[PDB]
Design an enzyme around this catalytic site. Structure first.
Site, PDB file in Angstrom:
ATOM      1  N   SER A  77       0.801  -1.221   0.000  1.00  0.00           N
ATOM      2  CA  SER A  77       0.000   0.000   0.000  1.00  0.00           C
ATOM      3  C   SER A  77       0.842   1.283   0.000  1.00  0.00           C
ATOM      4  O   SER A  77       1.606   1.523   0.922  1.00  0.00           O
ATOM      5  CB  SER A  77      -0.913  -0.014   1.234  1.00  0.00           C
ATOM      6  OG  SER A  77      -1.668   1.172   1.349  1.00  0.00           O
TER       7      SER A  77
HETATM    8  C1  GTX Z   1      -4.104  -4.948  -1.071  1.00  0.00           C
HETATM    9  C2  GTX Z   1      -2.802  -4.288  -1.507  1.00  0.00           C
HETATM   10  C3  GTX Z   1      -3.044  -3.067  -2.392  1.00  0.00           C
HETATM   11  C4  GTX Z   1      -3.770  -1.960  -1.632  1.00  0.00           C
HETATM   12  C5  GTX Z   1      -3.793  -0.684  -2.453  1.00  0.00           C
HETATM   13  C6  GTX Z   1      -4.766   0.339  -1.899  1.00  0.00           C
HETATM   14  S1  GTX Z   1      -4.320   0.983  -0.290  1.00  0.00           S
HETATM   15  C7  GTX Z   1      -5.574   0.191   0.731  1.00  0.00           C
HETATM   16  C8  GTX Z   1      -6.857   1.007   0.887  1.00  0.00           C
HETATM   17  N1  GTX Z   1      -6.577   2.256   1.585  1.00  0.00           N
HETATM   18  C9  GTX Z   1      -6.660   3.437   0.983  1.00  0.00           C
HETATM   19  O1  GTX Z   1      -6.953   3.564  -0.206  1.00  0.00           O
HETATM   20  C10 GTX Z   1      -6.364   4.655   1.842  1.00  0.00           C
HETATM   21  C11 GTX Z   1      -6.601   5.965   1.096  1.00  0.00           C
HETATM   22  C12 GTX Z   1      -6.596   7.202   2.001  1.00  0.00           C
HETATM   23  N2  GTX Z   1      -6.900   8.427   1.195  1.00  0.00           N
HETATM   24  C13 GTX Z   1      -5.238   7.338   2.679  1.00  0.00           C
HETATM   25  O2  GTX Z   1      -4.437   8.167   2.204  1.00  0.00           O
HETATM   26  O3  GTX Z   1      -4.994   6.629   3.675  1.00  0.00           O
HETATM   27  C14 GTX Z   1      -7.889   0.199   1.671  1.00  0.00           C
HETATM   28  O4  GTX Z   1      -7.803   0.087   2.890  1.00  0.00           O
HETATM   29  N3  GTX Z   1      -8.855  -0.372   0.960  1.00  0.00           N
HETATM   30  C15 GTX Z   1      -9.929  -1.186   1.526  1.00  0.00           C
HETATM   31  C16 GTX Z   1     -11.109  -0.363   2.013  1.00  0.00           C
HETATM   32  O5  GTX Z   1     -11.047   0.885   1.939  1.00  0.00           O
HETATM   33  O6  GTX Z   1     -12.105  -0.972   2.465  1.00  0.00           O
END
Ligand code: GTX
Ligand code: GTX
Lengths: 209, 209
Positions: free
Chosen positions: B9
């Site tokens: 992430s």
């Molecule tokens: C699995 C490996 C790849 C992950 C890539 C995306 S990062 C994970 C995602 N979190 C975010 O997108 C956080 C975005 C937020 N704007 C920040 O900056 O913290 C999440 O928890 N997503 C699940 C949810 O929101 O329910």
């Protein structure tokens, strides 16, 4: 301080309320994106990302509504309650601000702008996501007066600018009593809310009606 | 400080570099989203938005990576070496942070997520928007040592976590000389970059199998 904007723009309205909250006067510079005014050589030189709102405070050009909101609070804000210095308190306000941009407004945009501007068919999946966004906000507000606590902060101003756009778009806030309660509170207490109300209405009549 | 995350992430990696920079040790808690661990009842109670990164500093739950970054810099940072107090200089960093979330990373996800988690065909239109995002960053860097000035700030750490992901994704930085240079300076000066490199390499587990 030059303020390039459009009343119909939520981020622009967030700034308008914030500026009112700190008693700052803005030199309003209407910038019709629909006429490509944000693409004029002059604007591009101030902001290469050609987006509104854009603020120019004595030569200093700044964009990204929430960064502008913080700048105003920190530089012209005399009351700490708008944007508290306590790291923990400020952290919740910052989380709320990022939540507004990356989740609440973003999902709103994703669901509506394609229909409003591209005249494309509504996406059910994105509608559900938008609803979930409002639900998250409903939960944050549980047992609180405002988004980041019991004091009205810039986070509330940003969130209000967004929700008012939601309202006008026809969102049914019934399933979210905390949101409904907080939204009413902002209308009555949020500095310069008149401008937010006027902007949302202009958005409704120009791109929704 | 419990740190719910996953090395792949970008936002989580942004926090790890910032903690390294402030000299704070994080109690790492791998949270495999792919197994619904973030939807687990206990986590949900800590963060109803069920997302990572989520930090819990002695009972205080906080999410949105960039809010966490600011929280760490102000609360534990010394000499504000990563987040200047001067309103104007801070505004640039903040605008850079919002740019990272709403433009650079957002367009990255817009283009890759559907392909990675929906294995849908690549949208050339969205690839172009993604490219322009890097272009905006290339412009911001024009004659600058770092994203918001001469000093490395949490903005650079956030942008570097996002860009490291672009890189492992195969993005071509040749047409963006300022980004390539900046990025190089980040691999060599960003505290905890090794964690960012490793997590990014891990991410390929989403770009391979
Ligand atoms: C699995 C490996 C790849 C992950 C890539 C995306 S990062 C994970 C995602 N979190 C975010 O997108 C956080 C975005 C937020 N704007 C920040 O900056 O913290 C999440 O928890 N997503 C699940 C949810 O929101 O329910
Ligand atoms: C038409 C009236 C309704 C407009 C609604 C969308 S706001 C206008 C839009 N600006 C933004 O989206 C700003 C987002 C930014 N994250 C912020 O918070 O300021 C823009 O300038 N877009 C043009 C561009 O970026 O090129």
């Amino acid at each position: 301080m030059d303020f390039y904007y459009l009343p119909g723009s939520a981020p622009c309205r967030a700034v308008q309320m914030t500026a009112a909250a700190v008693g700052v006067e803005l030199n309003l510079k209407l910038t019709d994106l629909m006429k490509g005014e944000h693409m004029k050589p002059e604007f591009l030189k101030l902001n290469p990302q050609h987006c509104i709102p854009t603020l120019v405070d004595n030569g200093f050009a700044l964009w990204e509504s929430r960064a502008i909101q913080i700048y105003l609070a920190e530089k012209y804000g005399k009351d700490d309650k708008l944007y508290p210095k306590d790291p923990q308190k400020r952290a919740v306000v910052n989380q709320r601000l990022y939540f507004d941009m990356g989740t609440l407004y973003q999902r709103f945009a994703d669901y509506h702008y394609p229909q409003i501007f591209a005249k494309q068919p509504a996406n059910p999946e994105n509608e559900k996501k938008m609803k979930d966004a409002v639900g998250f906000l409903n939960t944050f507000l549980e047992g609180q007066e405002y988004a980041a606590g019991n004091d009205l902060t810039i986070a509330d101003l940003s969130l209000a600018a967004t929700i008012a756009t939601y309202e006008v778009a026809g969102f049914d806030f019934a399933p979210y009593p905390n949101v409904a309660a907080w939204f009413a509170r902002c209308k009555a207490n949020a500095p310069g809310y008149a401008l937010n109300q006027a902007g949302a209405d202009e958005f409704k009549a120009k791109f929704l009606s």
